[PDB]
Amino acid sequence: SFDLIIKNGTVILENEARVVDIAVKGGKIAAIGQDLGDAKEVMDASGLVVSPGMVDAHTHIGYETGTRAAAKGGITTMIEMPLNQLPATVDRASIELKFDAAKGKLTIDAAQLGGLVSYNIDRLHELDEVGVVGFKCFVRDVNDWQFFKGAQKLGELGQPVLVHCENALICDELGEEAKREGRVTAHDYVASRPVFTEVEAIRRVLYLAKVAGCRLHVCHVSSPEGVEEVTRARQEGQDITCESCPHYFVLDTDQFEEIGTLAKCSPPIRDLENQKGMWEKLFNGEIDCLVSDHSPCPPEMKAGNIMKAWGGIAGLQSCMDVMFDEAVQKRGMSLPMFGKLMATNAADIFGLQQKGRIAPGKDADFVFIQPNSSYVLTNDDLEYRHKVSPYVGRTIGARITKTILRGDVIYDIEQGFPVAPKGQFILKH
Amino acid sequence: SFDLIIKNGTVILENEARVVDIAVKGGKIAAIGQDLGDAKEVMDASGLVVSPGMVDAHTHIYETGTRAAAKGGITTMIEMPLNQLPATVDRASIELKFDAAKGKLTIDAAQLGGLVSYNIDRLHELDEVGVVGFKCFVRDVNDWQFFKGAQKLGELGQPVLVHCENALICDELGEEAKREGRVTAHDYVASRPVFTEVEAIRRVLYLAKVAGCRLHVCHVSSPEGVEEVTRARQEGQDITCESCPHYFVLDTDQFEEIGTLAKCSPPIRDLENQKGMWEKLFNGEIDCLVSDHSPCPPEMKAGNIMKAWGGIAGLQSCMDVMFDEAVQKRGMSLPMFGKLMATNAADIFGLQQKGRIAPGKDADFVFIQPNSSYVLTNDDLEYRHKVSPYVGRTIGARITKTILRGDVIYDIEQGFPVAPKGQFILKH
Amino acid sequence: SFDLIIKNGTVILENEARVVDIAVKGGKIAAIGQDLGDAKEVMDASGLVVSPGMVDAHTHISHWEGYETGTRAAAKGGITTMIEMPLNQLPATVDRASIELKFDAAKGKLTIDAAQLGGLVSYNIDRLHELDEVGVVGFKCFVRDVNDWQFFKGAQKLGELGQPVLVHCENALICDELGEEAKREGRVTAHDYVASRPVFTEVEAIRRVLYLAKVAGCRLHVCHVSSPEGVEEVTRARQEGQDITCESCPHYFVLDTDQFEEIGTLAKCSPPIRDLENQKGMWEKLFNGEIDCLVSDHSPCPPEMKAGNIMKAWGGIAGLQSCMDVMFDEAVQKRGMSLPMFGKLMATNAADIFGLQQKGRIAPGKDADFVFIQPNSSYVLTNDDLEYRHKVSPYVGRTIGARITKTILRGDVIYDIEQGFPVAPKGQFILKH
Amino acid sequence: SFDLIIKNGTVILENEARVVDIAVKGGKIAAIGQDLGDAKEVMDASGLVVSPGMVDAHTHIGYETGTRAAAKGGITTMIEMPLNQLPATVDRASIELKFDAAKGKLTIDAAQLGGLVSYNIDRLHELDEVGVVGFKCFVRDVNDWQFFKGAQKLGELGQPVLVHCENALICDELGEEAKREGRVTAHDYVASRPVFTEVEAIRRVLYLAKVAGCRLHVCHVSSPEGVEEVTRARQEGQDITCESCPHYFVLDTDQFEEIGTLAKCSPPIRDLENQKGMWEKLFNGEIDCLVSDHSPCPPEMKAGNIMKAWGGIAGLQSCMDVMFDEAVQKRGMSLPMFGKLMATNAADIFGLQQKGRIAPGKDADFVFIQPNSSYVLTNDDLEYRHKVSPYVGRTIGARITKTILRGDVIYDIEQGFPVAPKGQFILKH
Ligand SMILES: [Fe+3]
Ligand SMILES: [Fe+3]
Ligand SMILES: [Fe+3]
Ligand SMILES: [Fe+3]
Ligand SMILES: [Fe+3]
Ligand SMILES: [Fe+3]
Ligand SMILES: [Fe+3]
Ligand SMILES: [Fe+3]
């Protein structure tokens, strides 16, 4: 007696995509195949692609609207960033205060990341105990010594370090320099964050992490040259992974200029030539996962010139459909690879054993996608606190019809959000 | 209902080994999971590991041979072409072969065409028949025939498989040894040095790249050899490679004590080399393990090492010996074992129905009993000639069942329960 | 005191070219500097560049030529020491007997000095020690050619003898077949000839030889590299620490396929002359110090063998007399290469690679071998200026911006632009131990 | 007539060493060879090696004392460091004052280095105009922005940047850590400055210099791993050179433990196995020059444990003889290579056209060395302000007999310092 059965969809399995049925029980995938039998309920995925359901390894979060946007965007598990939050997630005390405040607002599931900061190097073991899945840092921030000592510690606890990689110093200087000269266009901003500032940062961190004996994950890589640094170190046998985001694949500096401060983000959006290289890296399997790096903010902060506007891209709701359209539909990527880049790889890298793949025993988390079905994103579609996004006015070639988490539909393109917040925090041991 | 359900076994799935059930219908995997229902026949695999049947990409052959394969846990073999009298080099060549094999296949068999110096014009023929690749030796082809042939294959969307050894240098060093009276196993190995393999691989890698042809490097014997393939792959070239159990479980000292039965072309090198190979295998630099089964009449195996015909009769020992050595002795995960013994080969050669325990694939399995030993004896062998360098070896795991397309074709208890039901596999 | 003093010239020393005087005594450089004293004879080189005489590491003397004519062509071209190839002449230089015969024949015919190379062939791997004993400075082979085993075994022995192996690197089989394929299709064009000798045939060959020689433990010298991809292999191998050097020739720097198509069979040679883009690459490699020396690979030929279409024609460039001035013009004048670099590439590097201790260096104690070059002074090469047995060359008709005015060998002027050849032949064979 | 002729010496020429005479006129080498004729004076160098005077590209100065020690040590040209001086050589005024303060004190010639500090990247042109031969900087120190900004300017001026490459931060933290746990041993000190702190810094600087478009010279390399980093970069086509010092070739950590604080220096003296690798690097031409990094100090600051004592090696007077003995005599290095490592390469790298080479038209700067003639270094032999050195007690197998600058003997092992100081500053253009 299965609780649910999803029939006739083109299901994305690890090796291939094929039409098979999925049986669900207790919120977990009970079986996969044909003539599964009877279930309390049945769903018809005919004409739909049933994907595992994004695992956004780079999410900044309020919980109610954000998680809401996530589900709508086909995201069933997010990995919450530690800093950029009221109390910074740096130890048990701080994270438990965060849990309490979130009680009942989670529409999707959430794994957690601890923050590696200049002052909690001796409390790292606390968040490891709690069940965090990794630690984030910027090289607030830590110096080379604190990074080395913190990484050495993380390596011993069996935790990976996640790093934002840019020489902030040279960037801020070039930026201010651009201020004094009156060059505040999207192109001036981008040039104040040249590729070498990313590459030098990546090289520094790769080396120190290696000597510290710590596994490393390079966040949002914006250039092929940055990707190349990650690949060469991996071929040397070092334990590292990297990720990028939809905006580095679907946007370029010219469009950034046209769009405005809404397309402004830390690692900047480079020119089309850079983008073509990124696409080559992606298809070559050199970028482990795609993440949103969703960074929302009050519109009052996105006001002013590019140079003084707050950086960050609000696109948590647009990752799955845009990438399915651009990657699979537009560029012909295989469906299984799409599943890997949006969910499986992140799940494996961060040890979310129950997530990221449609396989027996895993959580029944899915996203139903309607290929060849366009629409133009508009402000009123967004579920964000503030209905603004650099993707508004964009033609998206596919649609998310259903989003299922642990066996229940939490988002339906026709009935909206059918149930009460069903999400839970995920803590690993 | 399902024709069969295999219950409670530790199943080797794609990224994980799991205790789940497998339902089969019409020689196909119908479903995987729990609470599958019922079937005509039910098998309890409790305590057993259920692996995808081995896909041996390097087999030299049918009655005896396919029976040994089945008993060894091999459900699909990829048959070599330059062994048979009429060599598989064209349509009429392979057609004759199909007819003569009539009713002798105990397991399924994919096919390779031969790329020889005189058939570069007929390659498309075998391509049309449906072989999954072409084998060649650099009967043998010169650099020109190889470049010319590879270029054609690359256009046909076919990979070239290559025996990579500088034969000239190997032959001369051996002849040299004959002269000096050096004829032990150690002299034989020293007459087939690592550089003869490396030079050959480097040469073939470059020409295949220029020709625009996909390449698979056969039986690599040294980490140095593997290192060349890895370098090329990182440069973006489409190359894969294989090795054999004899390069991981035997070393020169054992070859010396065993005799001519452990004498093979790229030679079994010393223990240090072996350690390097295990390092490469665990690092995932060797795509698959293959038998390179090459039997022969004992008369040709008599004489000193230098004299003896080279070849390892080990088609029946590939699966259990590697499971024991890799998984039991060295801790390899079950999923990786499955990839190296079956999945990678299927993906490399496009055998979409094989090497994967997944929905819709052929129901080909081998049941392995972990921590259960026996000593391989001549009696146990299904080969035409009951000899093998593995005879007398203590193996810590046993094959209890082999299933091909839903049917048990080998049972540790019954032997061969059904008439040969294997089929040739031709891909289009 | 001194026998000769060359005054006021711009002398190419090892690290700089500068106006300084040179004193000579007993065929050797006695001193270098200012106010050297006086000499039996004084030459005024004001306005001229005084360079070390070229050391041609790749010379073929006859398939028609001979010591008399080729050696005079060399002197007129500014070459004072040639390193003779072994497998061209009829009695191939493969052992004691064959070289001694060669010597007896060349008696009194040498206008310039000549070091010697032995040949590594399939049947003399056992005799190699003989030429080493005589004193050749290296062994040449084509991979009568040697198969991979013969090359490996021979290089191993040479490495034991402390002798370098020089190799013509081209996958001949593929080249021949591709050539026969252009033939069948009626494609006998220069551009077609070049295409039947694609870059990968040179790269595959260099790769194979580099590896085998490394395993044989033998020092290697790659002959006439025609493409930057070929040079890149050598550089990579040297950066891995392998003992190897390589050379190229002026035809791969001053001619391209289009000019080759215009010139005809006289511009046909084994590694083919690639296109202009390939040439650009070669200049970059040369200026970057990745090509150790420039050599002629002078390969004279009877006019009957150069007749007909490009595929049928005998390959080989006759340019022994044009290496120095052409390259001085192209490299130093047109491209700005420093004079000392020019000296290294045309003389010093070859001398060092082959252990010619008395040559290619204008420094105290070395042989007084010089060539006087008149810069920014052009002339047009004509068949009549050629000293070869057969007066033809793809460089005929070329306007060269510098001229060789004098060539001095061991203290004596052997070629003078106003007088011709002043003295009877006095070159000697150079045998090293 | 020639003013002087040195006869019968084994002269180190560029290509080889041989017995030839050297003619001098007006302080310049007038000629080289045999039968040079007559001169006002004639020196017999029979049985001696005549080497070009050493060009020490890294010395810290006072002038009267340091210069005498230099001359007695066989050094004829030094390249003076800018920082860590009374006023710092960072601009016109600073160096101008320098010249006047040194008047009449120079026993040997001195080319000059300017400092690249945080407060003068806009004055760099001043020292370039005066004729400095390069600029030294650390990591006052400059941050990544100041380093990049200044190197960019230096590159435009055609000036090389010289850098002390160690991750200062991490070394200081590991050090404090040691003298917190009670580890104040020489072996503890070296461990507090691990090889990775030098590799990281070298990697950072190489890359930034590369992007800034500035020629770079890596100061006192202490490990083969560091040299390998420089070698890689050069093989990639970057204009980079590097140096090391005798103490990294002639001393190891055990000997340092034995000697005490006199052998304590910034990049630390590594273990014997590391020294082996260094010799290997030196022999295959991966290290352009050998410099002294002479750094004397009051013996007061050398009291106490290794952890709190001042770092610096007083060995200006012992570079030539110790290296001649170790490299050539003990290890079989050819004389022409010895000359390049001790003089020619430095001269070429820093444009000292008249120095480092025995060739026509160059300054008549030489040092006469008596091979296989030993002695034990004594405090008394030292000409330093403070007669102390980690080389005291050392058996040195060759001796400096005479030092000649611009044709005049300024040091004689039997007469001492015969002439009044005749050294001059060298400013290039
Ligand atoms: Fe960030
Ligand atoms: Fe972020
Ligand atoms: Fe084989
Ligand atoms: Fe085989
Ligand atoms: Fe040739
Ligand atoms: Fe030739
Ligand atoms: Fe320093
Ligand atoms: Fe210093």
Task: Select B1-51+357-368+396-418's CATH number: 2.40.50.140, 3.30.420.40, 1.10.10.10, 2.30.40.10.
Answer: 2.30.40.10
Q: Write the single-letter amino acid at C340.
A: P
Beta bridge partners of A32: A22, B32
Query: Quick one: DSSP state of residue D77?
Result: E
Residue whose C-alpha is closest to residue A82's, from A205, A164, A153, A158 = A164
Tallying the residues shown for chain A, one arrives at 429
Residue whose C-alpha is closest to residue A17's, from A65, A50, A63 = A50
Q: Which of A143, A148, A169 sits opposite D145 (nearest CB)?
A: A169
Answer whether C18 touches D (CB < 8 Å). yes
**Residues of chain C positioned with their CB less than 8 A from the CB of D284:** 241
CATH number 2.30.40.10 is the correct assignment for the domain at C1-51+362-373+401-423: yes
Which chain C residue lies closest to B194 (C-alpha atoms)?
A: C215
User: Per the structure block, which two tokens stand in for C275?
Assistant: 């296109």
Q: Write the single-letter amino acid at A170.
A: I
Report the b/e string of C210-224 with b at 16+ CB within 10 A.
bbbbbbbebbbbbbb
Distance CA(B261)–CA(B268), nearest Å, equals: 12
> Resolution limit in angstroms?
2.1
Sheet holding D75-80, edge to edge: D54-59, D75-80, D109-112, D425-426
Cβ of A32 within 8 Å of Cβ of B32? The answer is: yes
Distances (CA, A) of B26 to A16, B12, B70, B362, B405: 21, 21, 20, 9, 8
Distance CA(D208)–CA(A170), nearest Å, equals: 11
What CATH number does the domain located at A1-51+358-369+397-419 have?
Answer: 2.30.40.10
A109 is in an annotated binding site: no
In this structure, are residues C201 and C171 in contact, taking their beta carbons and an 8 Å threshold? yes
Report the b/e string of C67-87 with b at 16+ CB within 10 A.
bbbbbbbbbbbbbbbbbbbbb
Distance CA(A68)–CA(B84), nearest Å, equals: 66
Number of C-alpha atoms within 13 angstroms, CB side, residue D279? 17
Answer whether B143 touches C (CB < 8 Å). yes
Distance CA(B355)–CA(B132), nearest Å, equals: 15
Q: Which of B166, B198, B206 sits opposite C204 (nearest CB)?
A: B206
- The shortest C-alpha distance from D144 to chain A (Å) reads 7
3-state secondary structure of D350: coil
Q: Name all chains with 3 or more CB-CB pairs below 8 Å to chain D.
A: A, C
In this structure, is the dihedral angle defined by the CA atoms of residues A408, A409, A411 and A415, taken in order, positive or negative?
Answer: negative
Cβ of B15 within 8 Å of Cβ of A235? The answer is: no
Distance CA(B114)–CA(B136), nearest Å, equals: 6
In this structure, are residues B76 and B55 in contact, taking their beta carbons and an 8 Å threshold? yes
User: Per the structure block, which two tokens stand in for D388?
Assistant: 């102390």
B60 is in an annotated binding site: yes
Q: Which of D31, D348, D359 sits opposite C36 (nearest CB)?
A: D31
Strands (DSSP E) contained in D221-373 are 240-244, 289-290, 366-370
- H-helix segments, A270-403: 272-283, 319-323, 335-339, 345-349
In the block, tokens 């019409």 appear at B26
Residue whose C-alpha is closest to residue D323's, from D222, D271, D250 = D250
Distances (CA, A) of B143 to A383, B206, C175: 64, 11, 11
Class of domain B52-350+369-395: alpha beta
Distance CA(C249)–CA(C272), nearest Å, equals: 11
Ligand 5: distance of its center to the CA of C140 in Å? 10
Q: Which of A31, A235, A357 sits opposite B36 (nearest CB)?
A: A31
D87 CB neighbour count, 10 Å cutoff: 12
3-state SS, one letter per residue, for chain B: CEEEEEECCEEECCCCEEECEEEEECCEEEEEECCCCCEEEEEECCCCEEEECEEEEEECCCHHHHHHHHHCCEEEEEECCCCCCCCCCCHHHHHHHHHHHCCCCCCEEEECEECCCCCCCCHHHHHHHCCCCEEEECCCCCHHHHHHHHHHHHHHCCCEEEECCCHHHHHHHHHHHHHHCCCCHHHHHHCCCHHHHHHHHHHHHHHHHHHCCCEEECCCCCHHHHHHHHHHHHCCCCEEEEECCHHHHCCHHHHHHHCHHHCCCCCCCCHHHHHHHHHHHHCCCCCEECCCECCCCHHHHCCCCCCCCCCECCCCCHHHHHHHHHHHHCCCCHHHHHHHHHHHHHHHHCCCCCCCCCCCCECCEEEEECCCCEECCHHHCCCCCCCCCCCCCEECCEEEEEEECCEEEEECCCECCCCCCCCECCCC
Q: Which of A144, A200, A211 sits opposite D169 (nearest CB)?
A: A144
Answer whether B2 touches A (CB < 8 Å). yes
**Residues of chain C positioned with their CB less than 8 A from the CB of D34:** 25, 30-31, 364
Ligand 6: distance of its center to the CA of B210 in Å? 27
In the block, tokens 């950086």 appear at A311
Distance CA(C241)–CA(C249), nearest Å, equals: 25
In this structure, is the dihedral angle defined by the CA atoms of residues A377, A378, A384 and A386, taken in order, positive or negative?
Answer: positive
Q: Which CATH superfamily is domain D52-351+370-396 in?
A: Metal-dependent hydrolases (3.20.20.140)
Q: Write the single-letter amino acid at D403.
A: T
Answer whether A149 touches D (CB < 8 Å). yes
Q: Which of residues 19-48 of D touch C (CB under 8 A)?
A: 20, 23, 25, 29-37
Find the discontinuities in chain B where C to next N exceeds 2.5 angstroms and give the residue preceding each: 61, 138
In this structure, are residues D411 and D72 in contact, taking their beta carbons and an 8 Å threshold? yes
Name the burial class of residue C145, with classes exposed (0-12), middle (13-18) and buried (19+) by CB atoms within 10 angstroms of its CB. middle
Q: Which of C148, C173, C177 sits opposite B168 (nearest CB)?
A: C148
β-pair type (B398-404, B365-369) = antiparallel
Distance CA(B254)–CA(C63), nearest Å, equals: 59
In the block, tokens 């020490």 appear at D56
Answer whether B14 touches A (CB < 8 Å). yes
| Residues with Cβ within 8 Å of residue A42, at least 6 apart in sequence | A4, A5, A6, A7
Q: Name all chains with 3 or more CB-CB pairs below 8 Å to chain C.
A: B, D
For chain C, the domains span 1-51+362-373+401-423, 52-355+374-400
Q: Which ligand is nearest to the CA of A291?
A: 2
- How many B-C residue pairs are in contact by the CB < 8 A criterion? 42
Question: What one-character-per-residue DSSP string does A299-313 give?
Answer: GGGS-S-TTTSPP-B
Which chain C residue lies closest to D237 (C-alpha atoms)?
A: C288
Residues near ion ligand 8 (Cβ under 5 Å): D 293
Distance CA(A44)–CA(A67), nearest Å, equals: 26
D100 CB neighbour count, 10 Å cutoff: 7
Q: Which of A149, A170, A204 sits opposite D148 (nearest CB)?
A: A170
3-state SS, one letter per residue, for chain C: CEEEEEEEEEEECCCCEEEEEEEEECCEEEEEECCCCCEEEEEECCCCEEEECEEEEEECCCCCCCHHHHHHHHHHCCEEEEEECCCCCCCCCCCHHHHHHHHHHHCCCCCCEEEECEECCCCCCCCHHHHHHHCCCCEEEECCCCCHHHHHHHHHHHHHHCCCEEEECCCHHHHHHHHHHHHHCCCCCHHHHHHCCCHHHHHHHHHHHHHHHHHHCCCEEECCCCCHHHHHHHHHHHHCCCCEEEEECCHHHHCCHHHHHHHCHHHCCCCCCCCHHHHHHHHHHHHCCCCCEECCCECCCCHHHHCCCCCCCCCCECCHHHHHHHHHHHHHHCCCCCHHHHHHHHHHHHHHHCCCCCCCCCCCCCECCEEEEECCCCEECCHHHCCCCCCCCCCCCCEECCEEEEEEECCEEEEECCCECCCCCCCCEECCC
φ/ψ of A181, rounded to 5, equals: -95, -10
Equal fold, A1-51+358-369+397-419 vs A52-351+370-396? no
- The shortest C-alpha distance from A237 to chain D (Å) reads 18
Distance CA(C128)–CA(C136), nearest Å, equals: 10
**Residues of chain B positioned with their CB less than 8 A from the CB of A38:** none
User: Per the structure block, which two tokens stand in for C208?
Assistant: 């194979």
Q: Which ligand is nearest to the CA of B60?
A: 4
Distance CA(B116)–CA(B89), nearest Å, equals: 7
The distance of Cα B387 from the centroid of its chain, to the nearest Å, equals 19
Ligand 7: distance of its center to the CA of D348 in Å? 22
D220 is in an annotated binding site: yes
Residue whose C-alpha is closest to residue A401's, from A20, A73, A10, A23 = A73
Ligand 2: distance of its center to the CA of A427 in Å? 21
| Residues with Cβ within 8 Å of residue D100, at least 6 apart in sequence | none
β-pair type (A408-412, A399-405) = antiparallel
Q: Which of residues 232-251 of B touch A (CB under 8 A)?
A: 234, 236
Distance CA(C396)–CA(D95), nearest Å, equals: 61
In this structure, are residues D69 and D313 in contact, taking their beta carbons and an 8 Å threshold? no
Q: With touching defined as 3+ CB pairs under 8 A, do chains C and B touch?
A: yes
In this structure, are residues D46 and D379 in contact, taking their beta carbons and an 8 Å threshold? no
Distance CA(B249)–CA(B271), nearest Å, equals: 9
A22 CB neighbour count, 10 Å cutoff: 27
User: Per the structure block, which two tokens stand in for C205?
Assistant: 């060959």
**Residues of chain A positioned with their CB less than 8 A from the CB of D149:** 173
Distance CA(A208)–CA(B309), nearest Å, equals: 55
Residue whose C-alpha is closest to residue B339's, from B108, B15, B30 = B15
B292 is in an annotated binding site: yes
Distance CA(A342)–CA(A323), nearest Å, equals: 9
Distance CA(D131)–CA(B231), nearest Å, equals: 49
Cβ of D33 within 8 Å of Cβ of C31? The answer is: yes
Distance CA(B44)–CA(B52), nearest Å, equals: 17
**Residues of chain A positioned with their CB less than 8 A from the CB of D211:** 196, 200
Q: Write the single-letter amino acid at A178.
A: A
3-state secondary structure of A13: coil
Distances (CA, A) of D295 to A257, B298, C394, D56: 55, 80, 64, 13
- D237 in the Ramachandran plot: left (φ > 0), alpha (ψ -120 to 50) or beta? left
Experimental method: X-ray
- The shortest C-alpha distance from A227 to chain B (Å) reads 14
Q: With touching defined as 3+ CB pairs under 8 A, do chains A and D touch?
A: yes
Distances (CA, A) of B416 to B68, B400, B410, B411: 11, 12, 5, 6
Q: Which ligand is nearest to the CA of D221?
A: 7
Radius of gyration of chain D (CA): 21
**Residues of chain C positioned with their CB less than 8 A from the CB of B147:** 174
3-state secondary structure of D411: strand
Q: Which ligand is nearest to the CA of C299?
A: 6
Distance CA(B208)–CA(B213), nearest Å, equals: 5
Helices B223-234 and B271-282 cross at an angle (nearest 10°) of: 30
Q: Which CATH superfamily is domain C52-355+374-400 in?
A: Metal-dependent hydrolases (3.20.20.140)
Cβ of D34 within 8 Å of Cβ of C364? The answer is: yes
Question: What one-character-per-residue DSSP string does A231-291 give?
Answer: HHHHHTT--EEEEE-THHHH--HHHHHHH-GGG--SS----HHHHHHHHHHHHTT-S-EE-
3-state secondary structure of A396: strand
User: Per the structure block, which two tokens stand in for B150?
Assistant: 């590879």
In this structure, are residues A281 and A224 in contact, taking their beta carbons and an 8 Å threshold? yes
Residue whose C-alpha is closest to residue C37's, from C25, C48, C28, C26 = C25
Distance CA(C197)–CA(C252), nearest Å, equals: 14
